Structures are given as C-alpha cells and as structure tokens.
Design an enzyme around this catalytic site. Structure first.
Site, short mmCIF file in Angstrom:
data_model
loop_
_atom_site.label_atom_id
_atom_site.label_comp_id
_atom_site.label_asym_id
_atom_site.label_seq_id
_atom_site.Cartn_x
_atom_site.Cartn_y
_atom_site.Cartn_z
N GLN A 1 0.82 -1.20 0.00
CA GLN A 1 0.00 0.00 0.00
C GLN A 1 0.86 1.26 0.00
O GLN A 1 0.69 2.15 -0.84
CB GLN A 1 -0.93 -0.02 1.21
CG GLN A 1 -2.09 0.93 1.13
CD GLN A 1 -1.70 2.34 1.46
OE1 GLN A 1 -0.71 2.58 2.16
NE2 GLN A 1 -2.47 3.30 0.97
N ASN B 1 8.65 6.79 9.05
CA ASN B 1 7.59 7.79 9.00
C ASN B 1 7.86 8.95 9.95
O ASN B 1 7.68 10.11 9.58
CB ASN B 1 6.25 7.14 9.35
CG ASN B 1 5.76 6.21 8.27
OD1 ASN B 1 5.87 6.51 7.08
ND2 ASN B 1 5.22 5.06 8.67
N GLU C 1 27.91 2.99 -9.45
CA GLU C 1 28.88 3.56 -8.52
C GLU C 1 28.25 3.84 -7.15
O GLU C 1 28.44 4.91 -6.57
CB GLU C 1 29.49 4.82 -9.11
CG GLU C 1 30.32 4.57 -10.36
CD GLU C 1 30.35 5.77 -11.29
OE1 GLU C 1 30.99 6.78 -10.93
OE2 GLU C 1 29.74 5.70 -12.38
N1 LIG Z 1 5.04 7.59 5.34
C1 LIG Z 1 4.10 6.84 4.77
N2 LIG Z 1 3.92 5.54 5.18
C2 LIG Z 1 2.96 4.78 4.61
C3 LIG Z 1 2.17 5.29 3.60
N3 LIG Z 1 1.32 4.33 3.21
C4 LIG Z 1 1.55 3.22 3.94
N4 LIG Z 1 2.56 3.48 4.83
C5 LIG Z 1 3.13 2.54 5.80
O1 LIG Z 1 2.41 1.32 5.78
C6 LIG Z 1 2.24 0.83 7.08
C7 LIG Z 1 0.94 0.04 7.20
O2 LIG Z 1 0.89 -1.00 6.24
P1 LIG Z 1 -0.29 -1.04 5.15
O3 LIG Z 1 -0.95 0.31 5.03
O4 LIG Z 1 -1.29 -2.11 5.52
O5 LIG Z 1 0.41 -1.43 3.76
P2 LIG Z 1 1.25 -2.79 3.66
O6 LIG Z 1 2.50 -2.72 4.50
O7 LIG Z 1 1.57 -3.06 2.21
O8 LIG Z 1 0.26 -3.94 4.20
P3 LIG Z 1 -1.08 -4.28 3.39
O9 LIG Z 1 -2.26 -4.01 4.29
O10 LIG Z 1 -1.07 -5.74 3.03
O11 LIG Z 1 -1.16 -3.41 2.17
C8 LIG Z 1 2.23 2.05 7.98
O12 LIG Z 1 2.89 1.76 9.19
C9 LIG Z 1 3.01 3.09 7.21
O13 LIG Z 1 4.28 3.23 7.78
C10 LIG Z 1 2.36 6.60 3.18
O14 LIG Z 1 1.66 7.07 2.28
N5 LIG Z 1 3.32 7.37 3.76
#
Ligand SMILES: Nc1nc2c(ncn2[C@@H]2O[C@H](COP(=O)(O)OP(=O)(O)OP(=O)(O)O)[C@@H](O)[C@H]2O)c(=O)[nH]1
Ligand SMILES: Nc1nc2c(ncn2[C@@H]2O[C@H](COP(=O)(O)OP(=O)(O)O)[C@@H](O)[C@H]2O)c(=O)[nH]1
Ligand SMILES: [Mg+2]
Lengths: 77, 434, 369, 199, 49, 430
Positions: free
Chosen positions: B11, B201, B249
């Site tokens: 995601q 984050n 590099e």
């Molecule tokens: N900084 C930042 N972190 C994001 C963003 N989108 C997702 N994350 C990170 O994704 C983590 C949560 O995981 P998910 O949103 O579920 O995405 P995933 O790791 O692929 O897991 P899935 O639910 O299977 O998609 C959060 O702790 C965020 O750190 C974003 O747009 N900006």
C-alpha cells in the site's frame, strides 16, 4: 427520576420550565413529536444523530494530478 | 541506451510510487494523457519507452493483494497512461500476517509477476538495475515483496537491487504486530539486496513541521519528499552533467563490506513559499544544513556513531569548488568524526538540470540543493529497538497461533533472531578502531 | 459604519506562485487595509493611499506601494450589491459626418459619468455591413442607410456604467436631428447633426439587442479588421495616466485641429514584459529607461495613428523637449506643455527618429492585432 | 416480462431533497421571501438574455440566505444544466422550486388583473395597487403583530421605488404566484385574492 | 545514424547567433543616432532658456 | 469482491438487523423501492458487497430473516423497507421458543435448521468470494440463543477458513427481561468460544445510560437504541466498502485484536454522540474525538473499563482527517495513561482511516477493545447461574428434552475456566 410529570402534550411555547426543559425544546422546533410520538411517526434518525451537513468529500486520493500554477502561463518575452 | 526497472508493492509502495511518477512525468513534458508535445534529446528513455507515435508507457510493475488501491489508479487522474494489464491485482488481503503473504496466497501471483517482469526486461535493452519500494510493517509488502526479491535474484544474479524500505518508527506506528513482520523481511533482504535506504515515518513528520510550518500534514505531503529524493538520485543517469554518477557507482563505492550495507538518507534544502527568497540558500550553508542531526529522513541519531562512507549528488548550477569548500568544512568540523579507515569518504557528482517542483507543492522554487544518501554505523540503534520489542513480545508466544496455522514453522522464528543478532554483532565489530 | 471588501491577487516575479490578499476598503475616511486569506497574518492595515472613489471595480487595476494589484472577484453579500448596479451595457457609434468632430464627442462623454471601456478602428465593409441593421431590411430606410455606412471611417465604443442603456439615450438626444434643435439644442444631435440620414451618433434601443450589436465588434471572432495603411505615418500613444484624468478627448481634438488626418483610435491592454519591448529603443539610452516602463503597465492606454505630408518631425514639433518642465517656459503652445506633469509621466509620446516611423506604428497595429 | 418492470433511467431526474428542502427553509423567511429569490434573479441578470453564469449562480444563491454545501450545489447544477452548454435558464429554476400552479388559481389571478385594469381603462400602474387593497388580508395567510400602518411600508418596499413603473399581465401572475408559495392551502390564497382586491 | 540530428542541429545554433550579429549591429547603429538627436536637441534649449 | 453475509435471529436480532439494513441502504443510496438515486459515482463501485443485482435493476439485500414464531417476521415486512428482502429468505417455524433452550436448539430447531442451512449455503455458493459471516443474536432470548448457536456451529463446521463475527446483547445486572436469564445466557457463551471468531458484546443497560447521559432524549424508544448499534455495525465495515489512505479488513483486526485463541471477547463504542441541543457548540477535532472514545461512560459494556486493563484495540476512523493528527493522539493516549495498558505489549493501539464518512456528519470513529473489564460481566452471570443452580431451579423443563444436568455442568466449568484464564494476565507480568 421525576422527569415528564408536570408537562403534558403542548405544542410551541416556553413550556413548564421544570427539570430538563431546554433540551427537548429545540426538537419540537426541529420537527414534530416532542417526545415518544404516541401510538406522526418519529424518524429515529432525527434524534440521535443531530444536525445534518450533507456532502461527500472527494476521494482525497485523486488529489495528485489536479494542480495549477497560473503564473506559468504568461506570454513572457 | 540505458534504462531502469521499478518494482512497486504494498500500500505504501503504491502511494509513494504515485508521487514519484508524478514528479517524473512533470519533469519531462509528457502530459497525463501520455502525449508529449514539447515545443529533442532522448532524455526520456530512462523511464519511458516510445510507443510508436506520441503516447508513452512507464516501465511500472504494480502489485497488491487487495483491489482497493489498485483500482483507484485505474479510475483516477492517470487512467489513459498505464498499461491496461500491468497493474496486477489480487483477490483477498493479507491482513498483516507475514505467513499469509509468503506461502499460500503469495505463491499464486509470483508467476504472473515474473511473466510481466520478463517481458519488461526483454523489451528493455540496457537494464541498469532495479529500484524497489516496499513496506515491512504490513502484510502484502513484507511477504510478497521479499519473495519477489528472492525470485528476481535467483533468476538474474549479478543485477544490482536498490531498496527504499519503509520500516517502523520508535513510538509512532500503526500495526500492533508490526515487529514480527519486520524481522523476517530483514532476514530475507539482507542476503539478496545490495543497497537500502531507511525512510521511517516519524522522521519525515519532524522535517515537514519544522521547515514548512505545517503542523497538520498528511501522507501525501510525505510522499513528495520521497519522490524528490528518488528523482534527485536517478537524475544523473539521464540528464547531462560534468561529474556523472552511475547507480553502478554505489555498490563499489558506498558499501565497505558485503554484509554491512545499510545506509540512511536526507534531503534539503526544503523551504516554503514564504521563507524562500529572503535567505541566501548559498552552496556553503546548504551543505551544513544537510549534516544537521535532525534533518535526516530516518529516526537515527548520527552523532552517536562514526561515519564510514557518504555520497552526495549536487544538482543545479553549483560550481565545483564550492562543493570542495563544503567538503573541507565538514571534514575539519570536529563535531563529526569519521571511521578510522576511511581517509577519503566522499563521492560527489555535479549535474545541470535545475530542480523542478510539482504544481501546488509546498516546496518553493530553488536553484540549489543536496541529496545526502550517506551510510553510517549509527543505524545500530534502529535494529536494537526492533530486536528488543521482538524479544519482549515473543517471550511468551503472543499472537503466535495466527502464524503457525498458515504454514510457517515454529522454528523459523529462531533463525530470524539469529541473523539479526549476527548483523548487530557485525555492526558493532566493524566500527572498532585499529 | 459600512465597510467595502475585495479579493486581490498579485503576480510577483521573484516568487513564482501567486497569492491572494484582501485590500479592505474603509469608506468612512478613505483608508486602505490589506489582509491575506492564507496564513492568517495582517498584511497592510489602516493607512490612506488616496485612491479615487470610481477606480474600484472588477476588471480594472490600481498601483499601491510599488506592488500593482488586480481585484478579481467579490467576497461578501454587501459588497456586491452596492456596486453591482454599475454593470449595465450599451453600444455607442458615430457616423462619418462628425469624423472631424471625433475629439469633442469623446470629451463630453466622460462628463456624464459613464466610462469608455474600449474603442477600436474599422471601416464598415459592404459585405458584412448587410448582416448589420438586419431588422431594417423592410423599410425604405434600409437602402439609404446601406451606402452611408460604407462611405468612410467609423468609430465604435462600449460604455460601462449605470443606466447606460438609457442614460446614453437621453443625452444622445432624439433620433431626428432637426427636431432636436427646437426642443433639445444642448444635445449631441443639436450640435453636430445636419439632416436625418446624417444623424451624428446612435445608441442601442434594446438591451437584448444591446448584447447583439457588440458581439459583432469586440467579439474575438470579428469580421472587422483594423483598416490602415502603413506608409508615411508616425505613431503616438496616450500614456495611462491620461485615461484616468479624463482628458483623452481633449488631447484628441488638439492634434486633429492642427491639420493632421487621424485614422484610428484603439485601446490595448499590455502587461509589464510586453511593455519593455516597446521602449527598448530607449533601453539604456539617455532617458533613464527603468522608471518609465513600469508606469505604462499601470492602466490602459489609447494608441493613435497620425499622418501628414511630413510625418515624423513635423508632428514632433507640436509635440518644436522630452521634459514638459522645459516645455512650459519656452514652448507654451505645444501639446506636451498643456498636459505634462513630471519627468516620467509626460502625456503624449511620438516617435523621435526619422527612419523608424513605419515600424513603431506597425507594431501597435500589425504584430499585436 | 410485462409483470416485471425494468425501472432503470432514460432521462435525468430532479435531485429532490436538495430542491425540496430549499422549499421548507425558504418558507420560513416570509410571504415575500419567495419574491425575494425571483428579484435577486433579475438583479444578477442585468443583461436580459435569460440566465446566469456558473459562479454567479453561487453569488445569486448565496444572497437569499442559503449557504449550501458544495454537493448541495453539486447535484442541482447537473440536473438543471442538461449538456453543460455553460448556461441554465433561471426562469425554469423558479417554476420548479416554488411549487405548482393550478389552472383555477391562474384563472383567478388573471381575472383580478382584468378587473384592476377595468377601473383604469386598461392601464396599469403600481399606484392603483398601492392605493387600493386590504393590508389585513395578509393576516389570513399568516398572523402577525406588526401595525397595519407599517404594512403598507412593506408592500411598497417589496415593490419598485417609482410609482409609475410599467406592469405587465405576465408579471401580475408571477408576482402573486411568488406570494402563493408561502400559503399552504389554495383556498386560503384565493380568499386573500378577494379580500386584498375586494372581489 | 543518430548523429545526423546533431550535425544538422548543431548547425542551427551557430547560424542563429551569426544572424543575430547582423540584427544587433544593425540595431546598434540606430541606437547611435538617437543619442545624437536628443543631445544636440537638449543642448540648444539650454541656450534658449 | 470479498462480499459478506449477514444472519440474524430472534426478535432482537430481527430489529437490529432491520435497522442496520435501513442505515446501510440510506448511506449507499438505496431507497424503499430498491432503486438507485445515488449522487456520487463513488456510491456503486463496491455496492456488490452488501447488495446484489438482477434483471430489472432493484438491488436486493443478501440477508437472512428467521425465527420460530411468525409474528416477528410478519411485523418487519409490514413496515417500511420491508420490500427490499427476497420474499424467499423468510424461514419461520410454527411453535415458539418460550425461553427454553431445548425447545430451540435440539427438537424444534433441528426440525427447522435444515432450511436455514440450505438457504445460507445457496447464497454462499452464489457469492463470488466469501469474506466471512456476521451474526446478530441475543443470548438472553429463547429461540435465538439456542438455534442461532446451532446455526453458527453448522456454518463454521461446513466452512473452515471464513471468519465469523458475533454481536451479543447479553443480559444486564440490574434491568432483567427474563426470570431465567442466565440459563440461555451462560450456556450460549459456553458453546460460542470454541467456534465463533469475533464476539462484541452489546449491553442494553449501557444504551439507557449513554442515551440519558449524552443524547438527552426525554422518552427514548427501541427505535432510537437500535440506531446506535446499527451505526456501530455500519462503521465496523467501512474500508471494505470505501477507499482510503490505509484500508483495513475484518481479518486485519483479528490478527490485530486476538492475541490468543480463546480470548476473543471485544467491547465496542461509538462517537461523536451529541444531543440535539449542543450539536453546533462543540468543535470537531482529532483531540475532541479522542477523549470521548475512551470516555469511561461512553463504552457500551456494563463494566467500566477503568477496572481492568487493555490488551489490544483498534479505532477505525472515517472521513477526511490528517494522519499526523491520528498518530500523535494515539501516542498521547497510550503514554499519559502509563497504567492502563499491559506492559509486555508495545504499541497496543490500532489505527485506520477511510476517505468517505457517513452521510450528514464530519468525522466519527468506531472503537473496538479487547478489555479485561468484561470479567465482571461473566463473573456476575456465572455467579447468578451458580446461585440459582444450587437449588435445581427450573431444571425439570430443561431435563425434559434431552438435557442432562452434567451438560450444564460442563458449561459452568467452561465459564469459570475462561474467567480465570482471562483474569490471569492482569496480575501476570513480564
Ligand atoms: N510515510 C508513509 N507511510 C505509509 C504510507 N502508506 C503506507 N505506509 C506505511 O504502511 C504501514 C501500514 O501498512 P499497510 O498500510 O497495511 O500497507 P502494507 O504494508 O503493504 O500492508 P497491506 O495491508 O497488506 O497493504 C504504515 O505503518 C506506514 O508506515 C504513506 O503514504 N506514507
Ligand atoms: N435494545 C433492544 N433490545 C431488544 C429489542 N428487542 C429485544 N431486545 C432484547 O432481547 C431480549 C429478548 O430476546 P428475544 O427476541 O425474545 O429472543 P427469543 O426469546 O429467543 O425469541 C430482551 O432481553 C431484550 O433486552 C430491541 O428492539 N432493542
Ligand atoms: Mg493491499
């Protein structure tokens, strides 16, 4: 618990000014059925939720592409 | 005749890729439709392939186990550009369990992903390497991404792989079982990827606030900084310059040892639309702003560790000497100390295409900036915290029953902590003075 | 009391983006206060700048504190209603009997309080003339009016202001000129009308029609090219400060009475970067280039084409010194002297080089058309 | 299958709750509030072609006293603007919003206009309407405490300033039709017609 | 094969400047006369005043 | 995609599900006629999750309405929204339960359960890809509590991987609606732990307290109470229907809300709930939403959470908010309360966001909590059950339809063991 009591079915007016009068006052202004419509069906949505500000905001995911900076369209030289 | 392949999963991966491709498309004159009127050097072959007449297509691979986010790319503001079948979509979500995303549901998308990647590689002629963004504190990214990296390695071999991972933060995180997801992903990546960047984050929030005076940001704002960092990293390959830098590099210049190859990055200067034009933003000061402790994009204190290797890529109209003056200034500064065995530990490239800003962005137009992607042993702390959390929460088999049911073995967790401990010991030993 | 509000946005050059400010308007004591909608910081507060009452309205411009603003849209309920009354419309038009009287008719218009928002130059071609006055086909007045329209030059104007649909009419006077003298000696018809067919000027009788007539003239898709010939002529420009002071008409007749055959009066809106391309002839040359250019982009400006047996210098004579200050003492009967104010805001400006007369007039009328 | 209809949609439908709720709120303003919306329509349309531009609609709407949210405006414009030609007839706007006109009411409205013109010999003028009426006839539609002396003030204020302004028969029906929407019963409105006009 | 654009393209830049020189120099001279006209023009009025 | 199936029973289940369908249809734009009057294009992309389509175009709910007596099903149809249901999905008995398990789960239900099971299986096989089943039933009621548990057991046995949700209106300590409340109450939970995946208790007594303490309606009616639980359920499944920054599915919570196999008792809550009077006088901020959701009285459970601990919990935000505000408030709530959350779990607070809020409101949240406070709920019910079983009260009815006293013996042992094992962690330390 001694609510109700000294106030019978009356439409409009400041009421009896006893107990918890203010809270139910607005409802009768909002619409019919002051309390527990007798058995003028009362819509349950009216009481619990409150005032309605009806609009659906944009996805906020489709906010990337849309962006304009007018100062880039000047004829220049 | 040089190109790159981008791997996006998870995601957070998808959302970050959205901004990265936004910046890339705006930087080359190709409108959203795919048509580039310009009004012609082959500067667009690095990320885009000519379709025959006008319209282009980005070498993108998208993967997610849920249709929610994949669909929006097909129904948003870029629905006429991406390949109709290169947006792979799943059927059910992983639910933030590593086991689910690595042995049962993650094994019925690898074939399709390999097919798409094989077609991309075959069509490409001078594939320089891979760029991968994936999140570990979640379901889809950690498992599917790790398995994809494994397969890519076993399939191709010597091709380099670069990872802009998304790890958890010290105190701000979403998942309640995030630690377990991290360790397995790290165990998978350490022995198959080459260069990785920590981009937690929490750190991005602090920079956003303290610079742009925006106390209520959102993920979208954070995406733009990562997109800018990626663009600055990859610009040299496609834009003309005097001191070019080839992604080749970094393996031979910014990884002292085969195993210790974890490094943290930073980006600046970042000045809003008001505080932009009333300062100097000269070459000298900008460099000093890059090494400040709080500016870095990863919640890793640099002052608590030695430096082992740092690389900087300037952009804009910088003159070479001022690069030298800054280097000498930081070298002489006593506050920063270098490892005992890195006498010359800077590698600087100078480009010519000025930085470009997406519309309506918080970043006001600037004419100089530095994208520090250095590496330091200070990263030890981040692995300490995750290991400590793993020990505390695995002491008595909490949340374990979920994993064992999906296919994962009970004894696997033993290996992961073993590898993490080995890596921590390696980091501690390497930094010792002669 | 009552407060007027506006929305203002400024196109900086150093900063790429364009902001949005407030420019609060206290009508009690002629004060200007400016605030920004974004970032919530008081921007400019409670200091008079002496801006005339009539200047504020949509589409205009005004310069204050080295920053030039442009009110774009209204903000609140009360602001719109007070000035919303000044949006009515009407098309003016002067027939070729008064061609020698062009200067005067322009002057008296400004007195009534209306505004000359735009004005151009056309000789009505016979082919597209017929489409005009379409409603007059049946009557015998058609054929008589046909040829007269095509005889000679015509001038068209658009008036923006209150009751312009009728206030133009009443001053403009009854249709037939002869009857005007007996009843309305002090009227447009009375002073410059010979007979019925040579009625001096006209007005739009109906609003719904009033929309029609203009779409023919100032609409982008227009079949009236700027008729002119680019041989043996010199160009002069009424600088912006004049169109604000209400002597545009007065300057026009003065040149006409000198024996010069005027051919056109047209209005152009040009921004700062375009302006600099006109005075490049003075780019670093003597006249201290920087100061003047910034003013020419402080409002509209009429452009005049003039002719005579000898074009460049002769017109310059009556225009026989750059600074008006020297003009008053030793050339009291020159154009610059009567209207000039200071070194940089000196009224008319006519070409002062023999061999470049053709191009400068061409630029206003060929490249920017 | 005739016993089963396919419903679906072949033509756009009036959104409804965006339009109706405007009716409920607009009721509370007063007897001349309905006239207020019409007047504000003309005042914005000082060009006499038949409509208002995109934004001005926002201007025109946000003067009567409805600060609708964007979607509230969002739904309304799609139904009214059939093909996004850039203009929507405001005349249709008023006909749909206020309510519905019965043939008898229009017939009764016309008859009063003929009677009013009969006394003046076919000529019309606001002076005649101002000079002859029952200010208390407005009491029937909704009671009030305002003095009858001031009532005449409201009637002139809601009318034009000049007493010699031309009045058209089509305007006469429109003017009363604006009032009728405030009354909730046809019988009550027409009795005002007689009481106000003494017929 | 791709070098043709550079060979032809490179031609475009060099000639563009050369044409510029005639445009400027021709533009420069007329700059010379104007200063003479106003100068001598101004000089008289100092005596006349 | 990943559509879900809803099963309700008993009078309480019927009312709750009917009101839930009302709210869902209102939000998704489905009217009493079952036709489409939607406005935003975003109102149909995931419509199939809660509605199907057929020729003609009147969207239908994939729900099940059923009970052992005809009156309740008769009442629901007569009211508005009663024409959306498939006329076929009405499965009803002819005798009535009478507040005795055996009359509901062994003889009568066994005679009737076949039809309900068949209908459920047909709907499941029809649906493209199942996600799980959510059931609204009352343990204190006669018919629902018994035969509903039989339905759940059969469905889980038939489908191994699909997840099961359970909403239970357990009895309240003070206001009782049956002279034999604990029998059908305790035994139901005894049988539910081994099969049901997610259980979220809902207490009637809390509704009255929450209502008269915040909503401030002088004379509430059952219609009003049903609406709050309906909104809670509607928010429980937000991301699965609408897009957002960080989508969350039902499984995510289970991996995030169930540390152990046998501890799957959750308590829920809703906010912001404000009376009709102060609606416009209170701000709408991430901060103001935070205090209310943790507000001790706002939780829907009889036991106040301030008497135990918190192991895991999730908050599913809806509407446009800024993530930065979301995370910081979570850190504040987890830190400034240094002793309200078990010390051996780090970051035991969940976050989630969706980009479409319910109609007519700015921003609101649904709180799900794995709180040890529930121990009082079970201990009180179990204590009363043992107290009234000490005297072999009312046993002749139950023993008369294949129920033996020892089976009751197993249920109370299961209850006590669950209570003890669930309470252990409060004193257990790392
Ligand atoms: N900084 C930042 N972190 C994001 C963003 N989108 C997702 N994350 C990170 O994704 C983590 C949560 O995981 P998910 O949103 O579920 O995405 P995933 O790791 O692929 O897991 P899935 O639910 O299977 O998609 C959060 O702790 C965020 O750190 C974003 O747009 N900006
Ligand atoms: N809040 C609320 N509770 C209800 C409602 N209807 C029933 N209940 C609860 O459900 C219980 C009765 O369950 P019932 O429907 O008779 O189940 P049955 O006995 O198996 O048929 C009572 O204890 C009530 O507290 C309702 O409309 N609202
Ligand atoms: Mg996903």
């Amino acid at each position: 618990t001694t609510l109700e009591s000294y106030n019978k079915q009356l439409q409009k007016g400041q009421g009896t000014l006893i107990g918890n009068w203010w809270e139910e006052r607005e409802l009768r202004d909002v619409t019919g059925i002051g309390r527990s419509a007798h058995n003028s069906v009362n819509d349950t949505n009216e009481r619990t939720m409150g005032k309605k500000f009806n609009h659906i905001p944009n996805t906020t995911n489709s906010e990337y592409g849309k962006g304009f900076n007018k100062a880039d369209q000047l004829p220049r030289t | 005749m040089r190109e790159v392949i981008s791997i996006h999963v998870g995601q957070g991966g998808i959302q970050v890729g959205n901004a990265c491709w936004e910046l890339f498309c705006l930087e080359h004159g190709i409108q959203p439709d795919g048509q580039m009127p310009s009004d012609g050097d082959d500067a667009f072959n690095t990320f885009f392939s000519e379709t025959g007449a006008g319209k282009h297509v980005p070498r993108a691979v998208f993967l997610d186990l849920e249709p929610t986010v994949i669909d929006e790319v097909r129904t948003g503001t870029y629905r006429q550009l991406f390949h109709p079948e290169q947006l792979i979509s799943g059927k059910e979500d992983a639910a933030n369990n590593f086991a689910r995303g690595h042995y049962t549901i993650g094994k019925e998308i690898v074939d399709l992903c390999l097919d798409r990647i094989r077609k991309l590689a075959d069509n490409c002629t001078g594939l320089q390497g891979f760029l991968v963004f994936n999140s570990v504190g979640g379901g889809t990214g950690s498992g599917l991404g790790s398995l994809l990296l494994e397969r890519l390695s076993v399939d191709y071999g010597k091709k380099s792989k670069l990872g802009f991972t998304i790890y958890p933060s010290p105190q701000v995180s979403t998942a309640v079982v995030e630690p377990y997801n991290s360790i397995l992903s790290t165990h998978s990546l350490l022995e198959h990827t080459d260069v990785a960047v920590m981009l937690d984050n929490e750190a991005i929030y602090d920079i956003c606030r303290r610079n742009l005076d925006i106390e209520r940001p959102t993920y979208t704002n954070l995406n733009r900084l990562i997109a800018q960092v990626i663009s600055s990293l990859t610009a040299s390959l496609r834009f003309d310059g005097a001191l070019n830098v080839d992604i080749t590099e970094f393996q031979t210049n910014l990884v002292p040892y085969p195993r210790i190859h974890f490094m943290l990055s930073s980006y600046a200067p970042i000045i809003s639309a008001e505080k932009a034009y009333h300062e100097q933003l000269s070459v000298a000061e900008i460099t000093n702003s890059a090494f400040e402790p709080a500016n870095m994009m990863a919640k890793c204190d640099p002052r608590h560790g030695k430096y082992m290797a740092c690389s900087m890529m300037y952009r804009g109209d910088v003159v070479p000497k001022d690069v030298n003056a800054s280097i000498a200034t930081i070298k002489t500064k006593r506050t920063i100390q270098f490892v005992d065995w890195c006498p010359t530990g800077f590698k600087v490239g100078i480009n010519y295409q000025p930085p470009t800003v997406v519309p309506g962005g918080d970043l006001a137009k600037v004419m100089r900036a530095v994208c520090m992607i250095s590496n330091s042993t200070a990263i030890a702390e981040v692995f300490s915290r995750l290991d400590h959390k793993f020990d505390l929460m695995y002491a008595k088999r909490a949340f374990v029953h979920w994993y064992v049911g999906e296919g994962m073995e009970e004894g696997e967790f033993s290996e992961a902590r073993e590898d993490l401990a080995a890596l921590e010991k390696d980091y501690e030993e390497v930094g010792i003075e002669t | 009391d009552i407060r007027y509000i506006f929305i203002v946005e400024w196109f900086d050059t150093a900063a790429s983006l364009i902001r949005t400010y407030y420019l609060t308007y206290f009508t009690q004591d002629k004060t200007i206060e400016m605030y920004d909608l974004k970032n919530k910081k008081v921007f400019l507060k409670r200091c008079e700048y002496a801006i005339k009452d009539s200047d504020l309205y949509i589409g205009s411009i005004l310069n204050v504190y080295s920053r030039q603003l442009k009110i774009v849209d209204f903000a609140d309920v009360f602001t719109r209603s007070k000035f919303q009354n000044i949006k009515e419309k009407t098309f003016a038009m002067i027939k070729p009997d008064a061609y020698i009287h062009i200067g005067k008719i322009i002057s008296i218009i400004e007195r009534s309080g209306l505004q000359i928002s735009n004005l151009k130059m056309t000789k009505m071609s016979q082919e597209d003339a017929r489409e005009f006055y379409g409603e007059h086909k049946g009557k015998p007045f058609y054929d008589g009016l046909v040829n007269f329209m095509s005889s000679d030059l015509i001038v068209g104007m658009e008036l923006v202001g209150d009751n312009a649909i009728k206030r133009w009419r009443e001053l403009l006077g009854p249709t037939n000129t002869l009857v005007a003298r007996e009843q309305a000696p002090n009227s447009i018809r009375g002073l410059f009308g010979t007979d019925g067919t040579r009625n001096a000027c006209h007005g739009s009788d109906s609003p719904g029609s009033a929309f029609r007539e203009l779409n023919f003239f100032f609409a982008k898709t227009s079949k009236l090219k700027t008729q002119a010939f680019f041989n043996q002529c010199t160009c002069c420009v009424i600088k912006p400060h004049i169109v604000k002071q209400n002597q545009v008409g007065e300057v026009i007749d003065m040149i006409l009475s000198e024996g010069f055959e005027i051919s056109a009066l047209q209005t152009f809106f040009l921004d700062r970067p375009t302006a600099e391309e006109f005075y490049e002839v003075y780019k670093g040359v003597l006249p201290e280039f920087n100061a003047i250019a910034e003013h020419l982009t402080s409002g509209m400006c009429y452009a005049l084409e003039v002719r005579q047996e000898n074009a460049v210098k002769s017109f310059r004579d009556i225009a026989g010194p750059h600074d008006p200050e020297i003009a008053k003492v030793i050339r009291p009967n020159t154009i610059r002297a009567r209207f000039g104010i200071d070194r940089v805001k000196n009224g008319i400006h006519c070409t002062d080089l023999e061999d470049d007369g053709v191009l400068e007039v061409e630029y206003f009328f060929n490249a920017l058309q | 299958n005739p016993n089963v209809n396919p419903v679906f949609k072949l033509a756009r439908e009036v959104p409804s709750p965006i339009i109706n709720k405007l009716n409920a709120d607009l009721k509370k303003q007063g007897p001349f509030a309905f006239r207020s919306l019409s007047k504000a329509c003309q005042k914005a349309d000082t060009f006499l072609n038949g409509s208002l531009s995109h934004d001005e609609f926002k201007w025109v709407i946000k003067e009567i006293g409805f600060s609708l949210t964007k979607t509230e405006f969002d739904n309304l414009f799609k139904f009214f603007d059939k093909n996004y030609e850039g203009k929507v007839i405001y005349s249709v706007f008023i006909d749909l919003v206020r309510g519905q006109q019965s043939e008898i009411i229009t017939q009764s409205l016309s008859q009063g206009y003929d009677a009013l013109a009969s006394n003046n010999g076919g000529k019309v003028t606001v002076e005649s309407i101002v000079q002859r009426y029952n200010p208390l006839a407005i009491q029937i539609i909704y009671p009030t405490r305002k003095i009858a002396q001031d009532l005449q003030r409201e009637f002139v204020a809601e009318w034009g300033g000049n007493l010699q302004q031309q009045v058209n028969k089509n305007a006469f029906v429109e003017f009363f039709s604006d009032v009728r929407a405030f009354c909730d019963s046809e019988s009550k409105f027409h009795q005002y017609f007689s009481n106000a006009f003494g017929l | 094969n791709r070098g043709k654009a550079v060979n032809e393209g490179n031609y475009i830049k060099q000639r563009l400047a050369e044409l510029r020189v005639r445009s400027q120099r021709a533009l420069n001279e007329r700059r010379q006369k104007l200063a003479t006209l106003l100068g001598r023009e101004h000089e008289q009025y100092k005596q006349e005043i | 995609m990943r559509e879900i199936v809803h099963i309700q029973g008993g009078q309480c289940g019927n009312q709750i599900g009917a009101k839930f369908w009302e709210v869902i249809s209102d939000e998704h734009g489905i009217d009493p006629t079952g036709t489409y009057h939607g406005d935003s294009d975003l109102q149909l992309e995931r419509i199939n999750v809660y509605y199907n389509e057929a020729t003609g175009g009147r969207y239908v709910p994939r729900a099940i309405l059923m009970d052992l007596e005809p009156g309740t099903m008769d009442s629901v149809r007569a009211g508005p929204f009663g024409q959306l249901f498939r006329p076929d999905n009405f499965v009803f008995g002819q005798t009535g339960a009478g507040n005795n398990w055996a009359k509901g789960h062994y003889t009568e239900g066994a005679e009737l359960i076949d039809s309900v099971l068949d209908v459920v299986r047909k709907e499941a096989e029809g649906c493209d890809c199942l996600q799980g089943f959510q059931i609204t039933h009352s343990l204190g009621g006669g018919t629902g509590s018994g035969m509903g548990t039989l339905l759940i057991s059969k469905v889980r046995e038939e489908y191994p991987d699909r997840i099961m949700e359970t909403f239970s209106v357990v009895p309240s300590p003070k206001v009782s609606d049956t002279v034999v409340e604990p029998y059908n109450a305790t035994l139901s939970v005894h049988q539910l732990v081994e099969n049901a995946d997610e259980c979220m208790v809902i207490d009637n007594e809390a509704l009255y307290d929450i209502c008269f303490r915040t909503l401030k309606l002088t004379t509430p009616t059952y219609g009003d109470l049903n609406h709050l639980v309906s909104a809670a359920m509607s928010g429980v499944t937000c991301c699965l229907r609408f897009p957002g920054q960080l989508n969350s599915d039902l499984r995510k919570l289970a991996v995030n809300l169930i540390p152990f196999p046998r501890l799957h008792f959750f308590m829920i809550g809703f906010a912001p709930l404000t009376s009709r009077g102060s609606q416009q006088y209170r701000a709408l901020t991430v901060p103001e939403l935070t205090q209310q959701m943790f507000d001790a009285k706002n939780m829907m459970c009889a036991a106040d959470p301030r008497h135990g601990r918190y192991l895991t919990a999730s908050a599913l935000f809806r509407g446009r908010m800024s993530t930065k505000e979301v995370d910081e408030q979570m850190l504040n709530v987890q830190n400034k309360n240094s002793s309200y959350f078990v010390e051996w779990i780090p970051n035991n607070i969940k976050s989630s966001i969706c980009d479409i809020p319910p109609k007519g409101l700015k921003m609101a949240v649904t709180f799900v909590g794995n709180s040890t406070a529930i121990q009082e709920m079970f201990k009180r019910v179990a204590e009363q059950f043992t107290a009234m079983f000490r005297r072999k009260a009312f046993l002749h009815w139950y023993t008369g339809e294949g129920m033996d006293e020892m089976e009751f013996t197993e249920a109370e042992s299961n209850m006590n063991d669950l209570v003890s094992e669930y309470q252990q962690y409060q004193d257990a330390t790392a």
